[PDB]
Write a protein that binds this ligand. Structure first.
Ligand SMILES: Cc1ccc(OCC(=O)N2CCOCC2)c(C)c1
Length: 291
């Protein structure tokens, strides 16, 4: 899977909100482009003159994420964040010249991402009460990953003393994205656990935070909620479920070639952090079959 790289694997089966610090600083922003940000403005003008209903939105930028020494007391993760936008993303990560920007960032700053917007995404491994994970089918008509399989997710929106409010928005946003797209009541969802961070090398290294969320509804009940919205209540064109038993070998299935990179990141981290038991009971051969 060259199109996904793990930046962070969380310890302890995943981190709760109270164990994470954020540092939001203009030091963590994208660097101005070599020949100026006029190149971003030109791409945006061309786009608006074709699709004048499009508009810009602020986003969090991922600079880096440092884990504490394992087994320590106190905060376990520091997220270094800056600010970016949908406009800056279209002019950098989704530019035809994105690989040239990565090479120039290595040369100029010793940082392949220095000239990239790198907006932070969120996604969820969402488990049902009857032990399935939730998958969504993408429209064949959209620009990104058309017709591919995804997991629920979206965007934390900017709109430890500003730090704790930013961590709150990250955790809140993955629940809101589940409620908006799957049409589930908020009170059927657990507080999220952060599993890790994955990068999409097909989008020039754009990173997503991947979370575990448990729902108190069965797969049949989740399906009913999703469908009862009607086609206008969701961006996806379908919902489906895979037993958690079978997610263990998903990379060996024909489904793996249909998964978009950020969804592959969610499933790899689910397998490593929530699966992959370490104890004698769950590690015994009848509960963890060899191969
Ligand atoms: C991969 C990726 C996909 C969408 C996206 O942001 C979308 C957005 O902010 N929009 C503004 C309002 O109009 C709709 C689009 C970003 C930052 C990354």
């Amino acid at each position: 899977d060259p199109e996904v790289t793990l930046l962070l694997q969380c310890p302890g089966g995943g981190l709760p909100q109270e164990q994470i610090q954020a540092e939001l600083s203009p030091a963590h922003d994208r660097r101005p482009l070599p020949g100026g940000d006029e190149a971003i403005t030109a791409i945006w003008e061309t786009r608006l003159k074709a699709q004048p209903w499009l508009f810009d939105a602020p986003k969090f930028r991922l600079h880096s994420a440092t884990l504490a020494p394992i087994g320590s007391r106190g905060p376990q993760l520091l997220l270094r964040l800056g600010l970016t936008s949908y406009r800056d993303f279209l002019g950098t990560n989704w530019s035809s010249s994105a690989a040239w920007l990565r090479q120039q960032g290595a040369t100029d700053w010793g940082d392949t991402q220095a000239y990239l917007a790198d907006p932070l995404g969120v996604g969820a491994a969402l488990a049902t009460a009857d032990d399935f994970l939730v998958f969504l089918r993408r429209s064949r008509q959209v620009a990104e990953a058309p017709g591919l399989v995804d997991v629920p997710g979206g965007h934390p929106e900017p709109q430890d003393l500003a730090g704790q409010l930013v961590v709150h928005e990250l955790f809140s946003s993955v629940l809101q994205e589940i409620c908006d797209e799957v049409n589930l009541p908020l009170l059927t969802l657990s507080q999220p656990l952060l599993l890790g961070i994955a990068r999409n090398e097909t989008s020039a290294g754009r990173a997503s935070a991947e979370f575990y969320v448990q729902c108190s509804l069965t797969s049949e009940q989740v399906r009913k909620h999703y469908l009862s919205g009607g086609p206008e209540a969701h961006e996806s064109t379908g919902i489906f479920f895979v037993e958690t038993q079978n997610v263990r070998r998903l990379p060996e299935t024909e489904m793996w070639a249909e998964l978009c990179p950020s969804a592959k990141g969610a499933i790899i981290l689910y397998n490593r952090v929530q699966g992959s038991p370490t104890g004698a009971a769950l590690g015994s051969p009848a509960l963890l079959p060899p191969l």
